[PDB]
């Protein structure tokens, strides 16, 4: 049958892609860097603890000024914090109780959220009247959403359960463009500093390289044995990192369409929940479900202090535009400013 | 100058924790309740006792708030926001008494679930005349899905309605138990269910679900103290 | 690559034994409990079968509990699946899936009509 062909020609264009690719790998990144020099222990305490949220936290993201970042918790509360002041600033109400992801505009006008409504709620904090209010809800989605991205004041990029990646247009309220590749849930996503290629993993244990401009998979990335629970980007662009729940943590190239490293421990069984880098790249952080994040090298596997603070299973995790200070988030409705 | 800025975020600050305490009466307060069942199990019935993704339904029992959320509209894959459910007071199942033995298995997954252990499971074994009409004609015997049916025996404990068939007593009895040998294996001393019998008529669901919800606070008290 | 091929089947006569296997790859083998789903024409998803990681907990399903054996090799990587005097309830493709967390004793979604840790069906039509 059709089928039958189809399907053939399909596993003849994934050898032909390995062949390549396996042609193309000359020396593992980790023979080039066996004569850098590692940097040590970067053992380090946290700074402030904020506090005031009633359920389990499940994102978080931080503010381009690298001062303000806000979390969603269960209770279906919205709670913008100041990382330098500790005093709490905004304090917005959910019409739903199932918030499962947070964002941030890249200019501090806008904040996001999306749970088990299947509905993404865009939030306006520089209003006339001084109080917080829901500006735009978005529907269309099928399944829970799991991630949103602000790329700009007019356009979003939110990923749903529903298999589908979609680029939604404010002040429309329709889809722009939507990405059907992934055939299972997609968890988390992030953007590059361009504005214009992003890339998101799933719950196929594959991570896709889309573009927004055409609305197509550039790239897929693989490696995974388990669903992708998080992802970010080297501070170049050309790289970037993705966390499962299988306790390995991978270094992807854009140029290179492969796996390099595997920042994995037979210590640590947990799954990733959250993944970042430094501002130089220089570093890598990792949150577990054992309640403390590990610390890494992007040059090498280099374990650092672990940031052991956390009573319940870490959900979220940032890293600050500056690179000063990181922030972890919990299950226990607490949250931490490591620097 | 620098002052007022503090003061300013203390006083926003005050505002927002004020609302929080507020809110945090009502959210200790409620006992949420997960209403899960499968395709055409009957579940609507329950809900009209008293598009979007999930559905709400507030309703008091005797000054007590209950919260049941259906799940509608979200595909089967339950692995990422089952998670979400590991704070709920009780999730009520909702079965169609192969279409038990996948309730058995969702109830096994539920169960012995790493963030779901902890939340104990309300059973409802729903049309229950619709099942006992069927096994008096003997058209469609469940022992076809059950080789077992044929050994299992009336248990000594059987309070059968009068004038209900003799093999409707084995036959809501041993639908029972199926459950109670997945929920009495993995049962540490966390969590418990509590089967139910629930007709298509019976009215009387909402009072079983406020007699299982007051027996699991009960023993969650008990258990702060280390008594039970 | 996560990829799950199965083999055997095929049109067998009412009372005769058959075989399956389920081969692994771009995982750990040993590291994650499989199980095995049908469809049946006209019909949704139905589980058939699981086995542990160390092979202690099998379970069956109760339809045919006693005919059906299942079996792993962690060395291989490589499960089978016996069955043993098929009957017309039985002719439903055979899809090998795999559970997504390591290391759990429960497994969601092994039924859902779309998996991703899901290889293909194997056509098993039990005819004179």
């Known amino acids: 049958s059709e089928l039958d062909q189809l399907r053939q020609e399909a596993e003849q264009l994934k050898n032909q892609i390995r062949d390549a690719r396996k042609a193309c790998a000359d020396a593992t990144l980790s023979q080039i860097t066996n004569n850098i020099d590692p940097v040590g222990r970067i053992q380090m305490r946290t700074r402030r603890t904020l506090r005031g949220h009633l359920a389990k936290i499940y994102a978080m993201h931080w503010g381009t000024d690298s001062r303000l970042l806000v979390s969603a918790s269960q209770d279906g509360k919205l709670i913008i914090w100041d990382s330098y002041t500790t005093n709490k600033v905004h304090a917005i109400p959910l019409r739903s109780s199932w918030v499962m992801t947070c964002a941030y505009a890249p200019s501090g006008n806008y904040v996001a959220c999306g749970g088990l409504d299947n509905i993404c709620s865009i939030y306006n904090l520089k209003t006339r009247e001084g109080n917080v209010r829901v500006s735009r809800e978005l529907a269309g989605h099928t399944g829970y959403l799991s991630c949103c991205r602000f790329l700009d004041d007019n356009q979003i990029v939110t990923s749903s359960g529903d298999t589908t990646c979609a680029l939604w247009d404010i002040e429309t309220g329709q889809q722009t463009t939507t990405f059907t590749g992934h055939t299972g849930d997609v968890m988390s996503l992030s953007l590059a500093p361009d504005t214009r290629l992003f890339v998101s993993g799933a719950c196929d244990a594959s991570a896709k390289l889309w573009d927004v401009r055409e609305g197509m998979c550039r790239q897929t990335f693989t490696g995974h044995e388990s669903d992708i629970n998080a992802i970010c980007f080297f501070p170049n662009g050309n790289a970037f990192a993705t966390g499962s729940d299988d306790a390995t943590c991978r270094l992807f190239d854009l140029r290179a369409d492969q796996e390099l490293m595997t920042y994995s421990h037979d210590n640590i069984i947990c799954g990733i929940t959250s993944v970042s880098f430094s501002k130089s790249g220089r570093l890598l952080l990792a949150g577990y479900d054992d309640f403390n994040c590990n610390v890494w090298d992007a040059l090498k596997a280099d374990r650092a202090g672990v940031l052991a603070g956390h009573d319940n299973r870490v959900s979220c995790l940032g890293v600050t535009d500056d690179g000063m200070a990181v922030a972890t988030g919990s299950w226990d409705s607490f949250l931490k400013i490591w620097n | 100058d620098q002052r007022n800025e503090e003061k300013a975020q203390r006083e926003a600050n005050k505002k927002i924790e004020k609302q929080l305490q507020k809110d945090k009466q009502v959210y200790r307060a409620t006992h949420r309740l997960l209403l899960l069942g499968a395709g055409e199990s009957g579940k609507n019935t329950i809900v009209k006792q008293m598009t979007s993704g999930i559905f709400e339904t507030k309703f008091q029992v005797d000054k007590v708030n209950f919260h049941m959320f259906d799940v509608g509209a979200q595909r089967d894959e339950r692995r990422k926001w089952i998670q979400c459910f590991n704070d709920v007071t009780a999730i009520i199942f909702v079965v169609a008494s192969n279409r038990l033995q996948a309730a058995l298995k969702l109830f096994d997954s539920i169960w012995n679930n790493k963030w779901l252990r902890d939340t104990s499971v309300i059973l409802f074994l729903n049309k229950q005349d619709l099942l006992a009409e069927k096994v008096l004609a003997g058209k469609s015997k469940i022992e076809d899905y059950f080789p077992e049916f044929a050994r299992y025996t009336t248990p000594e404990d059987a309070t059968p309605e009068p004038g209900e068939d003799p093999r409707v007593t084995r036959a809501k009895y041993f639908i029972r138990d199926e459950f109670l040998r997945i929920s009495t294996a993995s049962g540490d001393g966390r969590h418990y269910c509590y089967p139910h019998f629930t007709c298509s008529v019976d009215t009387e669901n909402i009072r079983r679900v406020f007699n299982d919800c007051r027996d699991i606070i009960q023993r969650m008290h008990l258990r702060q103290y280390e008594l039970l | 690559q996560v990829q799950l091929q199965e083999s055997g089947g095929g049109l067998v006569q009412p009372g005769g034994s058959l075989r399956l296997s389920c081969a692994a790859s771009?995982?750990?083998?040993?590291?994650?409990?499989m199980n095995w789903v049908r469809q049946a024409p006209g019909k949704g998803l139905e589980w058939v079968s699981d086995?542990?990681?160390?092979?202690?907990?099998?379970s069956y399903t109760g339809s045919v509990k006693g005919r059906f054996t299942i079996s792993r090799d962690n060395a291989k990587n490589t499960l089978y699946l016996q069955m043993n005097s098929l009957k017309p309830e039985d002719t439903a493709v055979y899809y090998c899936?795999?559970?997504?967390?390591?290391?759990?004793?429960?497994?969601?979604?092994?039924?859902?009509?779309?998996?991703?840790?899901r290889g293909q069906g194997t056509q098993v039509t039990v005819s004179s």
């Open positions: 899936a795999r559970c997504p967390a390591p290391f759990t004793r429960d497994c969601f979604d092994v039924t859902s009509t779309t998996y991703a840790y």
């Open positions: 771009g995982f750990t083998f040993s590291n994650y409990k």
């Open positions: 086995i542990s990681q160390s092979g202690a907990s099998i």
